[PDB]
Design a protein around this ligand. Structure first.
Ligand SMILES: Nc1ncnc2c1ncn2[C@@H]1O[C@H](COP(=O)(O)OP(=O)(O)O)[C@@H](O)[C@H]1O
Ligand SMILES: Nc1ncnc2c1ncn2[C@@H]1O[C@H](COP(=O)(O)OP(=O)(O)O)[C@@H](O)[C@H]1O
Ligand SMILES: Nc1ncnc2c1ncn2[C@@H]1O[C@H](COP(=O)(O)OP(=O)(O)O)[C@@H](O)[C@H]1O
Lengths: 257, 242, 273, 246, 258, 249, 234, 12
């Protein structure tokens, strides 16, 4: 909760949103005086979204370690939609935990089936799903403008979520995330396949040339399949061509649907 | 669609242009073929897909197709489109021979018929030539052998051997194994037993199905007799004894 | 279901025929057919008639048919139900149609009682050979109705009336007499037929001036049968806006002229025979 | 023709028999400048609101009027360039008339041409209608005329005219004026009677200033030719009409 | 908050016209209720999002005060529902004790289902409950200064129940603004933050194109921030230029030939 | 909106809903999908270089041609596609001889590409008012190079969009950016032909998908003395030969 | 948000009246760069900065000859300029061998305004997407006009276009009655007509090659001051 | 409970 331990050096990628997520995490927290002369406390609370596993999670995690920030692990549909009694009762206890706590952040995920669609008045319906949703909306604007706490949400799909609760003043922003260019594809072999038995002096862009539009976390599997062939040789250590044989298996060997 | 640049014009976001890669994606459904150039000879081959013993054997419209004494053409896939390229090539032969007072090369020929297709895919109200072809034969008074392969996108690329159409990838790996830019086959019969043998994987020992010519210096063109072929079809199988 | 136990709201309440104009003969064509079985049924047995079963209306909308659909309630004192031909469908197949059996029986357990049914063009199709995956559902929903009024299940002492603004598209098998034994068209009337309708509003609210109709109604060759209740109130809507709470024939003119062109910009769409 | 409909492309009669690709146009001209056309008892006169959209514009430098061969004045409204197009056809065809029949051009048969070239841009599928509402009025041995122009070709013969964003405003005066003058005014005086309009019509758009221009054609003043007016005449007018509206 | 009637622009034309349709629901029963003539019992109306209809709605309650509780159909969508449909029917006799307070429903009915058939899912309990709360109700010309109502996205898609269009059909499409309007709106959203006055919105007023009212609130809230994105206490006013296009971001990536 | 491109791509001559028209940019990509090229400015000459995609061991790779002369003193390379490139060559060199007939001198190079980059705008609109000739644009980023009097040793970079810039060095292919970086911090102003020819190979050993030799790249030079020509394999097998000791460490 | 139709071609009006494609053309040039100018009673100027790709590359050419008594600039697409330019040279050439009473400036606008009209109503074709600037000189003296793809040609004192332009025209509106009262002093209005271009940009070094000017007057033939001869005029 | 799942419905 108090340390994710994941850095900017952990992240290659597009990287650019983080200096924009370096906006509201600091000046409310450190220095509104830069903007006190014009519209003090001008930011109020933001959101994230992107396709699955584009570092949308890892991004905010990349900064909770910074600022001595202290976030949560009771997240999304996992631990509050399934074993359930008086979800807001935890939230009252949550803010009761958080009412005076400092250098801490809310954040959670999975919110498609949580508060994204309102059931369209079907599928059997659920009320506790909403009350604990609204119970936040009660606790939301308690002291956040004059206070110091922040708020961050996440989605695989923002417009798939609920736009009903988007009454501004309650909400500020939703920032996007997509796949990176080759350079974001470049500095990730510098960490992913780093931690492996591999030869040195190896150019790691030709693979980047030859893996177009694609997210990051699969490269972990490309690494997982990369280190598979000195094996297959009963040899020891990774070449670069081993990637090329692997990239053949996994992109055009995957695009078939 | 007089003009209209229907989808031939519309590039892709990937970059490709749909109807072209579609074409030679359709070509592979037709009869295979093959070409080889050895030391002094050049060789070609095709097949006849199995009929009911009614497909008229005498005057079948075949795959080899002359141009002059010293050039031929084989192809793959569509057939109604094949017959015009064969025409508006040999047209230019009789013309080139006339207004330059000397016959064609082959590096003059493949440029044309590989450049023509580009006009049938960079114009309006036109469908491409859903076909892929190759050229074969010597230049005048020259021992050198040449064959050039060309395909509907309009590119021509020389070779030493190559195959087009159906189950070529089941074949050409056999040829890169045996054939080599090291050293040709000696002479005619060498290329053929090498040539024919490569087919056999898709052949069901239909010797009737396959039809062959050769090409030689001084334009000694010829097609060969089923007996002369079949007596290669067997002794090559006599070598199977292991 | 309880939904059948909800529709019935004003099964009796009398809003009589004096509050209507233009239709002194249609009602003569209709007071004939309905009430007589339900007043003096032995006449059709005095004479040897298979009595009627079924009527409808047609003509463009906003015209006064629904009033007639209820104005008969005043004459009878007997029962009535209101219901659409739209709020029937749902996901679960048959549930839409089962209701139809639930209700005609519900008529039989308390009568004299009859039925109304709006906007039947939704249930008013020609049974197609080809279809979608689901549009045939309403067709199988329909034919229950096509059955029950004249089906093997005999029936008597209940009546149905329906209405559209699109007489076409209907399955003729419905239009078989015996399923409904007389038709009628309610049109936009003539000026005089449009004139009783004009004054009934003045008949209630505080009139002040003399008639001043015949030239006002000279403009009345355009209206429908129902835009005038708007017109009637619209005069006093701004006769008063000058804080002049005693109306005049001075101010309606600004209204009645006004309505025509705001009505024009999306009017005269179709007429449906 | 609301969506999945017919308004988008030309020459498709919407089921009430209409080309909804046309009636979008008359809103375009309605979203444009103002202009008028008046019948003197001996000729015509026109006007227009030139529109300062900035400070860097020069008086008497960028007109909003063109002209027929010698006499037939012609104005624009809504969109200018589409207007400027057919005015090139205006000067064109009238020369084909002149060279052939050895005389100047009469105005009724003139519209018989220009009232078809635009009509013949309505009926195809691969064209657009002229998004304007033109006016042209002139003089001839049979007297004088005035003709308004609509894109569908519904040109009639008026005595007073209007267009732009100030129509019902402006044309009211043109009706409220003429009933007080069944005589039919001569030339110089209808000028200031009309400039009264524009400095009244602009009331819509008081965010800005503007200016105008003037036409002139009559028998007693030009021999019945077209021109503008300068010097004290219109300057005596703009202050006059501005004086008598406060 | 108790913001003014307007808060929106210079739209005196609608509002000064509108509530004339609500004076009689508000008052004037002396001869109105002595004339007994029609009374729109909740001026339900329309206009897609982008407008200040909620503001025109709520600001009209600046004169007819109304407690801040206004709950919608997404409160009426739960499991084995009907207690929510109980709530709505009790909602007015509740408020009918003594209040000109009037809540504001909001309906995107088939924003969850399809509409391939015009015969439509006019929602279950609203279409039912809206009747009784509308049929059996008067305002008494005092302590009922307005009549509770709602609004929707598009007036083409509804199954008009009894009296859904019988009397309650007072309705206007809010005409989207023009350049004389617009520049004075965005003025409002900078009344709390001042900047370099070298270029007015009147300078912008010709540069706008296809801008509805709500998203214009997404202009200075960022462009006020895009200045202090570079920490200038003196707010610049060209950040609007490169921020207005952030409505959709333009995918501006290295214009090759342009 | 939801689909800015797919709802407006099929309209070949249609500007986007945000300004930059489409089928040009769809035509500006595929240059990368082909095979790289490279060329360098220099006062004692000019160098050009490519790969050739030795697909199979049967293709006699002396036969492929990503490179060709326009005239005696001009040479052009190619990229992307090649069937659509003959036509510009067959039009381009036509101008030089014509310029050497109507005017009888030797043609400039800046007076050339203007009559090449105009040609690829016949679709949609036309150059000098003429209507149209051809359906679609065609994507080959070219690299002309040639000596002249007024300016000397130059190159340009064609583009079917109608643009062209007097680079002093520029690459093509998907590996362009992956190397054009490497040239930016390496190109001096007073280099020699040879070290440039030694330079360029550094990239090809760097960028390429497979180990290179004679039959994976080739080169072509320029001189005011000889004009334009190429380098045979054994010559290519010698500049690469003595390449190595410079990277012995 | 949501898609619109009516953009698919340059022939359909909108439901309102816009030619929605046309505005998307005009989009490009504000998305494009800037090329501005102003007028004297005896002289008048063009000026525009440059762009590039990298530092290895030269800059775009942006201001184009058409005759001695006329010249122009551009801001937008490069091809359409040459079309008009290669067209425009012909008429100012055509008048110089048929009437030889040289071509004036204003009627040039009045015929190429009519160019774009013809190419904005038919199908098969496309609108020339540029808003360019132009100058001239005649018996009427010097002038300065503006272009749009609409056909709306307008005669003016000065003007700015392109991105980050508003402050510069705004500077010009603030500074109006001064730069034009002069005559025979071309090298001082430009000194105001450069700091004009100092309105909104980065330019953190010697803008020596990023910039180019031409000029004419009652005596000055159209010549483009380019290269380090411009550097003094910074 | 005293039941499990089972259903059917139209699609449009
Ligand atoms: N630039 C990057 N640097 C490091 N890891 C990355 C990068 N881009 C993507 N990833 C990978 O993406 C994954 C992100 O997972 P996560 O965001 O939790 O999934 P989801 O987005 O579905 O919640 C991680 O496993 C991480 O390794
Ligand atoms: N003939 C009429 N007399 C009185 N009111 C009428 C008449 N015709 C229509 N109306 C008005 O029309 C409304 C409903 O009429 P209705 O029967 O529903 O016609 P429609 O079914 O065409 O809407 C009522 O408000 C009523 O005042
Ligand atoms: N004309 C306008 N002037 C000022 N603000 C406006 C205008 N139109 C919309 N808004 C903004 O939109 C919001 C109000 O929109 P609302 O009426 O709630 O529309 P919806 O009900 O569709 O959300 C406010 O934040 C307001 O500032």
């Amino acid at each position: 909760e108090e340390k994710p331990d994941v850095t900017y050096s952990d992240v290659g990628g597009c990287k650019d949103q983080i200096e924009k997520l370096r906006e509201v995490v600091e000046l409310p927290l450190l220095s509104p005086e830069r903007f006190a002369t014009l519209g003090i406390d001008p930011p109020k609370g933001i959101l994230l979204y992107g396709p699955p596993g584009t570092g949308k999670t890892l991004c905010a995690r990349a900064v909770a370690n910074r600022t001595d920030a202290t976030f949560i692990r009771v997240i999304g549909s996992e631990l509050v939609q399934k074993y359930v009694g008086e979800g807001a009762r935890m939230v009252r206890e949550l803010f009761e935990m958080a009412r005076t706590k400092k250098a801490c952040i809310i954040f959670f995920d999975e919110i498609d089936a949580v508060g994204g669609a309102r059931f369209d008045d079907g599928a059997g319906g659920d009320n506790e799903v909403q009350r604990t949703m609204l119970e936040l909306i009660t606790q939301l604007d308690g002291f956040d403008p004059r206070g110091n706490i922040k708020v961050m949400f996440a989605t695989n799909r923002p417009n798939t979520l609920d736009p009903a609760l988007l009454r501004p003043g309650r909400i500020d922003r939703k920032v996007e995330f997509s796949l990176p260019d080759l350079e974001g594809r470049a500095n990730i072999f510098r960490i992913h396949s780093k931690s492996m038995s591999v030869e040195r002096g190896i150019r790691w862009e030709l693979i980047s040339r030859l893996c177009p539009n694609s997210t990051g976390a699969e490269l972990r599997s490309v690494c997982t399949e990369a280190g598979m062939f000195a094996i297959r040789a009963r040899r020891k250590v990774a070449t670069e061509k081993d990637f090329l044989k692997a990239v053949d298996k996994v992109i055009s060997g995957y695009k078939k649907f | 669609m007089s003009g209209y640049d229907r989808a031939l014009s519309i590039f892709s976001p990937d970059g490709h242009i749909f109807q072209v890669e579609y074409a030679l994606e359709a070509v592979k459904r037709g009869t295979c073929a093959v070409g080889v150039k050895g030391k002094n000879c050049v060789v070609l081959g095709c097949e006849r897909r199995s009929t009911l013993k009614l497909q008229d054997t005498r005057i079948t419209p075949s795959k080899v197709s002359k141009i002059d004494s010293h050039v031929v053409l084989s192809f793959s896939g569509l057939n109604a489109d094949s017959r015009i390229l064969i025409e508006k090539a040999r047209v230019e032969a009789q013309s080139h021979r006339l207004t330059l007072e000397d016959p064609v090369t082959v590096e003059y020929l493949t440029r044309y018929v590989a450049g023509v297709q580009q006009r049938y895919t960079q114009s309006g109200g036109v469908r491409p030539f859903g076909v892929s072809t190759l050229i074969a034969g010597f230049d005048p008074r020259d021992d050198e052998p040449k064959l050039y392969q060309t395909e509907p996108s309009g590119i021509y690329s020389s070779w030493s051997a190559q195959t087009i159409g159906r189950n070529s990838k089941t074949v050409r790996e056999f040829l890169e194994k045996n054939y080599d830019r090291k050293e040709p086959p000696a002479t005619v019969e060498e290329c053929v037993k090498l040539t024919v043998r490569s087919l056999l994987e898709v052949v069901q020992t239909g010797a009737k199905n396959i039809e062959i010519t050769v090409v030689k210096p001084d334009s000694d063109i010829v097609a060969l007799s089923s007996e002369e072929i079949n007596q290669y079809v067997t002794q090559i199988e006599q070598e199977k004894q292991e | 279901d309880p939904l059948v136990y909800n529709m019935t709201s004003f099964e009796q309440g009398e809003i009589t025929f004096d509050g209507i104009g233009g239709l002194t003969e249609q009602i003569r064509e209709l007071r004939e057919v309905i009430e007589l079985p339900l007043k003096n049924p032995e006449i059709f047995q005095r004479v040897g008639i298979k009595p009627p079963k079924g009527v409808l209306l047609y003509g463009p909308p906003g015209t006064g048919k629904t009033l007639l659909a209820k104005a008969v309630a005043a004459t009878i004192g007997a029962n009535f139900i209101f219901s659409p031909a739209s709020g029937i469908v749902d996901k679960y197949i048959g549930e839409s149609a089962r209701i139809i059996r639930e209700m005609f029986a519900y008529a039989k357990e308390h009568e004299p009682c009859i039925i109304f049914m709006d906007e039947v063009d939704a249930i008013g199709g020609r049974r197609f050979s080809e279809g979608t995956s689901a549009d045939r559902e309403i067709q199988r929903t329909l034919m229950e109705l096509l059955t029950q009024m004249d089906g093997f299940d005999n029936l008597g002492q209940t009546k149905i009336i329906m209405a559209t603004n699109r007489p076409d598209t209907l399955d003729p098998a419905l239009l078989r007499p015996g399923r409904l034994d007389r038709k009628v068209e309610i049109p936009l009337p003539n000026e005089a037929g449009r004139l009783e309708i004009f004054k009934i509003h003045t008949a209630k609210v505080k009139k002040t001036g003399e008639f001043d109709f015949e030239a006002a109604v000279k403009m009345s060759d355009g209206f429908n049968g129902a835009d005038i209740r708007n017109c009637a109130t619209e005069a006093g809507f701004f006769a008063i806006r000058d804080d002049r709470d005693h109306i005049n024939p001075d101010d309606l003119m600004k209204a009645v002229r006004k309505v025509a062109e705001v009505k024009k910009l999306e009017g005269t769409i179709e007429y449906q025979k | 023709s609301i969506g999945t409909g017919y308004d988008l492309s030309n020459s498709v009669f919407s089921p009430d028999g209409r080309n909804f690709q046309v009636e979008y146009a008359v809103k375009a001209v309605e979203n444009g400048t103002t202009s008028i056309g008046i019948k003197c008892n001996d000729g015509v006169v026109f006007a227009v609101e030139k529109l300062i959209t900035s400070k860097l514009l020069v008086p008497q430098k960028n007109v909003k009027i063109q002209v027929v061969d010698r006499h037939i004045g012609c104005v624009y409204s809504g969109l200018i360039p589409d207007g400027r197009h057919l005015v090139n056809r205006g000067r064109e065809e009238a020369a084909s008339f002149k060279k052939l029949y050895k005389t100047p051009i009469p105005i009724p048969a003139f519209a018989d041409r220009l009232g078809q070239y635009v009509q013949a841009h309505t009926l195809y599928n691969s064209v657009r209608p002229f998004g304007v509402s033109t006016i042209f009025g002139g003089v001839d041995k049979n007297g004088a005329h005035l003709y308004m122009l609509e894109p569908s070709g519904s040109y009639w013969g008026y005595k007073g005219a209007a267009t732009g964003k100030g129509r019902q405003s402006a044309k009211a005066e043109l009706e409220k004026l003429v009933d007080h003058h069944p005589e039919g005014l001569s030339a110089r005086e209808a000028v200031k009677q009309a400039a009264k309009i524009i400095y009244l019509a602009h009331e819509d758009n008081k965010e800005k200033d503007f200016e105008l221009e003037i036409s002139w054609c009559s028998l007693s003043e030009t021999n019945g030719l077209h021109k503008f007016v300068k010097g004290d005449l219109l300057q005596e007018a703009i202050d006059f009409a501005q004086k008598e509206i406060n | 908050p108790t913001e003014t009637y307007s808060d929106v622009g210079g739209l005196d034309k609608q509002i000064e016209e509108l509530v004339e349709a609500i004076v009689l629901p508000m008052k004037r029963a002396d001869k109105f209720k002595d004339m007994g003539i029609r009374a729109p019992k909740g001026a339900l109306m329309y206009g897609p999002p982008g407008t200040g209809k909620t503001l025109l709605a709520r600001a009209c309650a600046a004169q007819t005060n109304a407690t801040f509780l206004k709950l919608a159909a997404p409160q009426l969508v739960q499991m084995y529902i009907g207690e929510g449909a109980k709530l709505v029917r009790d909602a007015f006799a509740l408020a009918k004790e003594k209040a000109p307070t009037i809540i504001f429903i909001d309906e995107l009915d088939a924003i969850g289902t399809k509409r391939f058939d015009s015969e439509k899912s006019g929602d279950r309990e609203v279409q039912r409950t809206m009747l009784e709360l509308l049929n059996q109700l008067d305002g008494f010309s005092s302590d009922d200064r307005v009549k509770v109502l709602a609004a929707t996205n598009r007036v083409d898609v509804l199954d008009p129940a009894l009296l859904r269009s019988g009397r309650l059909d007072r309705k206007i499409e809010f005409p989207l603004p023009s350049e004389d309007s617009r520049a004075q709106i965005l003025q409002i959203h900078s009344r709390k933050m001042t900047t370099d006055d070298d270029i007015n919105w009147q300078e912008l007023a010709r540069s706008t194109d296809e801008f509805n009212g709500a998203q214009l609130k997404a202009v200075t809230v960022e462009a006020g921030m895009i200045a202090l994105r570079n920490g200038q206490s003196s707010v610049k006013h060209e950040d609007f230029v490169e921020g207005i296009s952030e409505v959709q971001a333009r995918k501006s990536k290295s214009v090759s030939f342009y | 909106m939801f689909l800015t491109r797919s709802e407006y791509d099929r309209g070949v001559s249609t500007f986007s809903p945000e300004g930059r028209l489409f089928q040009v940019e769809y035509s500006l990509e595929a240059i990368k999908l082909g095979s790289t090229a490279i060329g360098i400015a220099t006062k004692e000459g000019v160098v050009l270089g490519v790969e050739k995609r030795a697909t199979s061991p049967l293709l006699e790779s002396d036969s492929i041609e990503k490179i060709v002369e326009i005239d005696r003193h001009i040479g052009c390379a190619m990229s992307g596609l090649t069937a659509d490139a003959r036509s510009m060559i067959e039009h381009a060199r036509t101008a030089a001889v014509t310029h050497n007939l109507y005017y009888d001198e030797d043609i400039n190079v800046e007076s050339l590409t203007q009559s090449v980059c105009d040609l690829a705008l016949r679709f949609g609109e036309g150059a000098s008012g003429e209507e149209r000739l051809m359906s679609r644009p065609f994507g080959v980023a070219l690299l002309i190079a040639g000596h002249d009097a007024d300016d000397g040793y130059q190159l340009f970079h064609a583009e079917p969009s109608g643009t062209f810039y007097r680079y002093n060095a520029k690459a093509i292919g998907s590996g362009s950016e992956g190397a054009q970086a490497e040239l930016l911090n390496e190109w001096h102003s007073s280099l020699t032909l040879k070290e440039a020819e030694l330079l360029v190979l550094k990239i090809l050993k760097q960028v390429m998908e497979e180990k290179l030799d004679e039959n994976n790249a080739q080169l072509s030079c320029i001189t005011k003395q000889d004009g334009f020509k190429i380098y045979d394999n054994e010559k290519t097998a010698e500049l690469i030969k003595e390449l190595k000791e410079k990277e012995a460490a | 948000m949501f898609r619109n139709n009516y953009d698919g071609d340059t022939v359909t009006f909108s439901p309102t009246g816009r030619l929605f494609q046309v505005e998307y053309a005009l989009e490009a040039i504000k998305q494009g760069s800037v090329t501005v100018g102003l007028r004297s009673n005896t002289h008048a100027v063009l000026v525009a900065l440059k762009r590039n790709a990298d530092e290895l590359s030269s800059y775009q050419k942006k201001i184009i000859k058409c005759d001695e008594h006329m010249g122009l600039s551009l801001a937008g697409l490069a091809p359409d300029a040459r079309v008009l330019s290669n067209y425009l040279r012909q008429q100012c050439n055509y008048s110089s061998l048929v009437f030889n009473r040289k071509l004036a400036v204003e009627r040039a606008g009045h015929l190429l305004c009519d160019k774009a009209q013809k190419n904005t109503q038919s199908y098969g074709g496309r609108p020339y997407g540029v808003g360019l600037l132009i100058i001239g000189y005649d018996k009427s003296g010097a002038h300065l006009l503006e272009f749009q793809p609409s056909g709306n040609v307008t005669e003016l004192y000065g003007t700015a276009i392109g991105a980050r332009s508003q402050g510069a025209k705004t500077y010009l509106e603030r500074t109006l009655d001064t730069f034009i009262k002069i005559d025979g002093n071309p090298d001082e209005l430009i000194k105001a007509g450069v700091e004009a271009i100092s309105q909104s940009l980065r330019d953190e070094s010697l803008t020596v090659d990023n910039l180019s000017i031409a000029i004419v007057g009652k005596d000055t033939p159209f010549t483009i001051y380019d290269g380090e001869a411009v550097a003094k005029y910074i | 409970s005293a039941r499990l799942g089972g259903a059917s419905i139209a699609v449009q």
